[PDB]
Structures are given as C-alpha cells and as structure tokens.
Amino acid sequence: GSGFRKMAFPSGKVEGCMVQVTCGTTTLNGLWLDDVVYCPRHVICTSEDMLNPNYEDLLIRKSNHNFLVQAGNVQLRVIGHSMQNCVLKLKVDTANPKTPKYKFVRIQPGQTFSVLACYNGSPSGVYQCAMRPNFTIKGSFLNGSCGSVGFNIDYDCVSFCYMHHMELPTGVHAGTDLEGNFYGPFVDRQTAQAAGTDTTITVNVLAWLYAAVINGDRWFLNRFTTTLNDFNLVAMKYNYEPLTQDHVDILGPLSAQTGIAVLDMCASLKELLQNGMNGRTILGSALLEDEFTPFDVVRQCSG
Amino acid sequence: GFRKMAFPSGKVEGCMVQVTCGTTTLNGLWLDDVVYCPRHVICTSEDMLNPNYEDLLIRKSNHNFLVQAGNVQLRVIGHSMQNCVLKLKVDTANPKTPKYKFVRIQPGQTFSVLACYNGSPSGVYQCAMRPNFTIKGSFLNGSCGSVGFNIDYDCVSFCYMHHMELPTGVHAGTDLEGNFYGPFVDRQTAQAAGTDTTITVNVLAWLYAAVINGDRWFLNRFTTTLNDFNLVAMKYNYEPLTQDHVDILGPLSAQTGIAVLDMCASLKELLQNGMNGRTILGSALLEDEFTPFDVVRQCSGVT
Numbered sequence: 110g111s112g113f114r115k116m117a118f119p120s121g122k123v124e125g126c127m128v129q130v131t132c133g134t135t136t137l138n139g140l141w142l143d144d145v146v147y148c149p150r151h152v153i154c155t156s157e158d159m160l161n162p163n164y165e166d167l168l169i170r171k172s173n174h175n176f177l178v179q180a181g182n183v184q185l186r187v188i189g190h191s192m193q194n195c196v197l198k199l200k201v202d203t204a205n206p207k208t209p210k211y212k213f214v215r216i217q218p219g220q221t222f223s224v225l226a227c228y229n230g231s232p233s234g235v236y237q238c239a240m241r242p243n244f245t246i247k248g249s250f251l252n253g254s255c256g257s258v259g260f261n262i263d264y265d266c267v268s269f270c271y272m273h274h275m276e277l278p279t280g281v282h283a284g285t286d287l288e289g290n291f292y293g294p295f296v297d298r299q300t301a302q303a304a305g306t307d308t309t310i311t312v313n314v315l316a317w318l319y320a321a322v323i324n325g326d327r328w329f330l331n332r333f334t335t336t337l338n339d340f341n342l343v344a345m346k347y348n349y350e351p352l353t354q355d356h357v358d359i360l361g362p363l364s365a366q367t368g369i370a371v372l373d374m375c376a377s378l379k380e381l382l383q384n385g386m387n388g389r390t391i392l393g394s395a396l397l398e399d400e401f402t403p404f405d406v407v408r409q410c411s412g
Numbered sequence: 413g414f415r416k417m418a419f420p421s422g423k424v425e426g427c428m429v430q431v432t433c434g435t436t437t438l439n440g441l442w443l444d445d446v447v448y449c450p451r452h453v454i455c456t457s458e459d460m461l462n463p464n465y466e467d468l469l470i471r472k473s474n475h476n477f478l479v480q481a482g483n484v485q486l487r488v489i490g491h492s493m494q495n496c497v498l499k500l501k502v503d504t505a506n507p508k509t510p511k512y513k514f515v516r517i518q519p520g521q522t523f524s525v526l527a528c529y530n531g532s533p534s535g536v537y538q539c540a541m542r543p544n545f546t547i548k549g550s551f552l553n554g555s556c557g558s559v560g561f562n563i564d565y566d567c568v569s570f571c572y573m574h575h576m577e578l579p580t581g582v583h584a585g586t587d588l589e590g591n592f593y594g595p596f597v598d599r600q601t602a603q604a605a606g607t608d609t610t611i612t613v614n615v616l617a618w619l620y621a622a623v624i625n626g627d628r629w630f631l632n633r634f635t636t637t638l639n640d641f642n643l644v645a646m647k648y649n650y651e652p653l654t655q656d657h658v659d660i661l662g663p664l665s666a667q668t669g670i671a672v673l674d675m676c677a678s679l680k681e682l683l684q685n686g687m688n689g690r691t692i693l694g695s696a697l698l699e700d701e702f703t704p705f706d707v708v709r710q711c712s713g714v715t
C-alpha cells in the first residue's frame with residue numbers, strides 16, 4: 110500500500126470515563142469527568158417527543174431521581190441536572206477516579222479524531238474519523254451509540270471534540286462538541302435533514318502531497334507558485350475546499366520539513382487538478398487522500 | 413457505515429512498560445509478575461548479525477535490565493528465554509493485568525495492534541496476518557515489544573509481539589511464546605518474505621459488508637462453482653476458498669440473500685474486469701483485512 114493507515118489514539122483514558130444514562134427505557138452513553146456526566150439531551154425524549162421535542166418543557170418535568178446513571182452495573186447517584194445547548198449535564202455524587210487531564214475543544218472541518226463507539230456504556234471499538242467540510246462524519250454507529258465521543262490525545266491530555274447524536278439519510282453522522290453545539294446546521298429532532306454537498310479537504314490533500322515528498326515521491330512538484338486567492342478560486346471549481354489562514358499555518362511543519370513553501374505546493378496541486386494525473390500515481394495510488402491531517406502525516410512519518 | 417475498527421486498547425495499555433538493556437530501549441508486556449519482551453534487546457552492534465542468544469543471555473545479570481512502569485522502576489529478580497521472547501520476573505504484580513491468554517493466529521485472521529514507544533502507547537489499528545506471515549503494520553524505531561490482540565468479552569487474547577521491519581516496509585514478529593510467524597529470524601539482516609496473496613474469504617466478507625451498506629453495483633446475475641472460482645482466484649494470486657470459508661460466510665449470505673457462490677461470481681468479474689473507476693465502501697481496491705466475524709461483529713454492536 111501507501112505505508113499510511115488510519116490510526117486511532119489509545120482509548121483507555123476515554124474507556125475509563127464511559128457510563129450509561131437511562132431515562133425510562135431509553136439508554137445511551139455518557140461521559141463521566143470529575144463529578145459531571147455529559148450526554149445527549151435526547152435521552153429525555155420518548156418516541157413521540159422525538160419528532161418535535163420541547164426540550165425546555167421536557168426538562169422541567171424531569172427530576173434528579175428520573176436519571177439512571179451506571180458505570181457497569183453500579184449506579185451513580187444524580188444530585189443535579191442542567192441543559193447546555195444539546196447536552197445534558199448531570200451532577201453526580203462521586204468524582205470519577207479515572208478522570209484524565211482533559212479539555213473540551215471544538216474542531217474545524219478536516220480535523221481528525223478517534224471515536225470510541227460504545228453501547229450501554231461499554232466500548233465496542235475505536236477508529237479514526239475526519240470531520241467533513243459539510244460537518245458530518247463517516248462513522249460506524251448503530252442504535253444505542255449516542256453519547257459515544259470523539260477525542261484526540263496530546264501528551265497526557267484528552268481533548269474531547271465530538272459527541273454522537275444522529276444518523277442522516279445518506280448514512281453519515283452528526284453530533285455536537287462537548288458544550289452541546291452541533292457541528293453544522295443540524296438539530297436533534299427525528300426529522301429528515303440533509304447534509305450539504307461535501308467537498309474535498311484541501312488542507313489534508315496538501316498534507317498527503319507533503320507525505321509523498323517526504324517518501325521521495327515528488328514528480329508532481331513544479332517550478333511555480335500561486336497566491337492563496339488564485340488557488341482558492343481554482344480549487345472551488347474542482348469541488349475542493351478553499352484554504353484558510355489556519356490551514357496554511359498547520360501546514361507549516363511539513364513545509365519546513367521539506368523546504369517546499371505552502372503556496373508552491375498549492376501550485377503543484379492546482380496543476381494536478383487542471384491536468385489530471387495521467388496514469389501516474391502518488392504514494393502508489395491514482396486517488397488523492399483527504400483524511401490524513403498534517404499532524405497525522407508527521408506522526409506516521411517521523412513519530 | 414462500516415469502518416476498520418480496532419478493539420478498545422485500555423486493557424492492554426495498563427500492561428505496557430519500558431525495558432532497557434545497554435543502549436537499547438523497547439517495550440515490554442507486564443502480566444502478573446512477568447514482563448515479556450523481544451530478546452534482541454540484549455544484542456549489541458557486534459552481536460546482532462549472528463547473535464548466539466543462549467550465550468549472550470547467560471552473561472547478563474538481573475541488574476542489566478531496567479524496567480520502568482511510568483515513573484516507577486520494577487526490580488527484575490529473575491529472567492528466562494522462551495524462543496525469541498525474554499521473560500523478566502519482577503518483584504511486583506501488575507494489578508491491571510486483565511484476564512488473558514496467549515494464542516497463535518492463522519493467516520487471514522485479524523487483530524488490533526497497540527503501537528508503543530518507550531513503554532507509552534501511541535496508536536491502535538487493525539491488521540491481518542498476511543498469508544506470507546508478514547503484517548502490513550505502522551511501526552517505527554522503538555516499537556518492538558508492541559503487541560497485537562483480540563478481545564472476547566473480558567479476555568484479551570494476545571497473538572503478536574513486534575520484532576522487525578522488512579526491506580519492503582512490511583513487518584514481522586512472534587506469538588507470545590516467542591515463535592516467529594513466517595520464515596524470519598531475529599538477526600540484523602535484510603529479510604524477504606514469500607510472495608503474498610490476497611485473503612479471498614475476507615474480500616468476500618467485505619463485499620457482503622458493502623451490500624449491507626447499500627452498495628451493490630458489483631453484483632451480477634451469474635454464479636460459479638467453487639472449483640472454477642478457485643482456479644481463477646489462484647491465477648490472480650488470491651487464496652483458495654474452502655468449504656469451511658463458504659460455511660463461515662453463511663450468516664452474511666443469509667442476511668443479504670446472496671449465495672456465497674453468487675458473490676464469488678461477482679468477485680470473479682471484479683478480478684477479470686477491474687473496478688473501472690468505481691469504488692466499494694470508499695475504496696478503489698479490494699479490501700482483504702476484514703474477516704467474516706469482523707463484519708458480523710460490527711453489524712451487530714458486540715461490546
């Protein structure tokens with residue numbers, strides 16, 4: 110193959126935070142950090158409320174004693190509850206002894222993260238996802254998976270970035286950050302909702318081209334450059350995302366490692382888009398990969 | 413809705429330690445009061461071309477082995493060698509030891525790898541034991557002693573310990589009794605593998621996974637006999653399909669209503685005609701590192 114593959118972060122620090130939250134007969138997953146459990150607010154809905162729920166009214170009718178929180182078979186007593194956007198925050202009487210160093214981050218399209226898919230508070234598997242430009246992810250989620258989280262780990266600190274809420278008609282998935290704000294335009298109701306037309310993650314294609322150069326595969330490098338605006342206007346004609354200044358910056362380490370300026374690599378990509386690859390391959394493939402971030406490439410090339 | 417998924421790695425993370433001998437550092441697996449690691453940790457540069465391991469190990473003392481679990485040193489009180497694995501007895505039991513067994517896997521079976529550096533887990537990903545007994549891994553300097561495993565309920569079945577990279581960029585290692593998979597040797601030489609083949613039963617399982625996810629452009633109205641399929645498979649360097657494989661595909665055949673030999677006729681058409689620009693589950697190549705069990709376990713939410 111190419112020598113690259115989707116690699117998840119070790120999941121143990123997150124496994125130590127997964128619980129189950131049940132209201133009535135609806136059980137989903139929650140995230141237990143310090144003395145708070147975070148979960149999707151739709152745990153409070155019946156099937157009838159799910160079409161057009163009045164979450165404020167549904168929450169007023171609930172009390173602490175209506176929430177069953179369990180780590181395994183052991184009940185965790187709820188002593189407070191509140192709603193923040195689309196997440197429920199349940200205060201519990203016990204601080205999770207396995208709480209890692211953590212933060213809540215809201216990621217940008219193109220960023221990757223590891224998903225720990227869980228059912229009934231028990232982990233089933235871990236895999237890497239990329240946030241698409243239309244603010245959906247291509248996950249593997251079944252009934253009961255809501256409240257599963259996405260995360261990255263930097264040193265000993267877990268950055269939680271995603272909590273799972275729903276599946277769209279096209280089979281892709283949508284959710285919130287850990288403050289309960291949906292990524293994209295979606296809402297937590299049982300209605301038909303369409304993702305926007307997706308586009309290719311340009312910053313990650315550029316990271317892939319840098320990866321190819323690092324590995325000595327550099328036939329596509331040209332002697333030209335472009336402005337960022339000129340590249341963005343061309344990129345959009347090929348259903349590629351425009352680059353942001355942040356994208357330019359996150360390509361900084363790979364540009365320094367190879368000596369190829371970001372805008373020079375943009376000119377090389379522009380020629381690939383306009384001319385095609387013409388039977389040639391990059392890292393063994395005629396298809397450009399868009400789900401490895403600059404961070405993923407450096408991790409797999411340099412450690 | 414179908415992803416390459418690793419097992420949650422937490423049970424294994426709690427067992428990883430750092431082992432140092434001389435200027436060589438790699439990872440060890442700490443279970444109860446024993447640390448398992450690759451024996452080549454005892455080699456020097458003047459040794460590694462033809463290391464007489466029994467003669468090298470008798471010359472070592474317990475204090476020549478530095479074992480560190482986080483920021484704590486584990487005192488080695490004894491040592492022994494089993495094939496290519498060194499077993500360091502320490503004076504403390506690991507309270508994080510999971511229920512476990514050591515298993516030797518078959519070509520075509522999959523497992524999760526917890527890649528580690530300096531005793532610290534770094535990433536987790538799914539691999540298959542190739543028919544030529546290599547694995548297409550992601551391992552850098554210092555990764556030796558990283559392990560591969562499966563989980564069933566609460567029991568971790570360790571099947572792989574990492575030892576080496578081959579000139580082609582694939583990897584080789586042992587079971588936890590220290591016996592290599594394949595014709596490889598723990599000496600510092602460039603070693604080639606036998607010719608690899610594609611894991612046919614796994615390709616078929618993945619085509620079924622594609623149909624389960626609504627992708628059926630590759631199906632056809634035709635069927636084949638088992639022997640006629642195998643003749644074509646062998647011509648294309650695919651492994652033979654046995655009646656046991658056909659039986660193992662039964663549940664996926666029953667779920668989709670597509671007979672195994674009908675799917676074999678679809679695969680035959682893909683081998684002879686190619687995919688012609690189209691993709692299956694997002695892949696431009698036929699994927700052979702999902703077993704039939706992996707497909708079922710993912711389409712059923714097993715935790």
Ligand SMILES: *[C@@H](O)[C@H](C[C@@H]1CCNC1=O)NC(=O)[C@H](CC(C)C)NC(=O)OC[C@@H]1CCC(=O)N1CC1CCC(F)(F)CC1
Pocket residue numbers: 438452455460551552553554555556557575576577578579583597598599600601602603
């Ligand atoms: C763990 O100690 C380490 C893991 C390797 C490092 C790179 N990626 C990995 O997975 N294993 C080794 O260093 C191992 C040690 C011997 C004693 C078994 N050797 C090894 O993996 O060697 C890999 C290199 C690179 C590809 C290749 O052919 N070789 C062998 C090397 C032999 C000496 C040489 F001079 F001929 C150069 C090539």
